């Protein structure tokens, strides 16, 4: 069984320890300070009561839009075929679906991370941008921006709803 748990000051050191092993990118103290303030947008992932993963998100107001930014999402390498990634993603997509007012969900990923690209493609995410030297020192340093459109038409019925045509 997979369980998601809250990120508190009691277990933030555990999230940092998992993040430090899963990702080659060093996150600073301000990153872990912000995670303690996003509520349900940050979760620890548990498999048979053992912490093997985490998802950290924030609300972003870039591009004159209401966006959900997935900062980090991942599991320890031996636990990537246990549906923990799906549980974590369906959790953040639920916070968004319930909200109804988000324009999109987006994240950065190295261009060579095919397992993550293909995973996100299952939930409707597409490559919308490629950023040269988005990361420092790691190879490849080039990142794809993966985005899922969350915009739902506002209007009580068909005649007042603006959508694709």
């Amino acid at each position: 069984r997979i369980e998601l748990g809250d990120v508190t000051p009691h277990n933030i050191k555990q999230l940092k320890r998992l993040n430090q092993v899963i990702f080659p990118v060093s996150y600073n103290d301000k990153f872990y300070k912000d995670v303690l303030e996003v509520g349900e947008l940050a979760k620890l992932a548990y498999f048979n009561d053992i912490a093997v993963g985490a998802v950290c998100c924030r609300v972003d107001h870039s591009q004159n839009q209401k966006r959900l930014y997935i900062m980090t999402l991942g599991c320890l390498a031996p636990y990537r075929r246990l549906g923990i990634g799906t549980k974590m993603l369906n959790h953040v997509l639920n916070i968004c679906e319930k909200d109804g007012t988000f324009d999109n969900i987006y994240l950065h990923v190295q261009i060579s991370n095919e397992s993550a690209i293909d995973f996100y493609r299952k939930f409707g995410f597409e490559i919308i941008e490629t950023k040269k030297n988005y990361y420092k020192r790691i190879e490849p340093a080039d990142a794809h921006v993966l985005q899922k459109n969350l915009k739902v038409p506002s209007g009580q019925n068909a005649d007042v709803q603006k959508t694709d045509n």
């Binding site: 990702f23 990118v25 996150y27 990153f31 930014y69 900062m71 980090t72 991942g74 994240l107 950065h108 990923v109 190295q110 030297n133 988005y134 990361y135 420092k136 340093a141 990142a143």
Partner: peptide, 4 residues
Amino acid sequence: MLGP
């Protein structure tokens, strides 16, 4: 994975 937030960068850089």
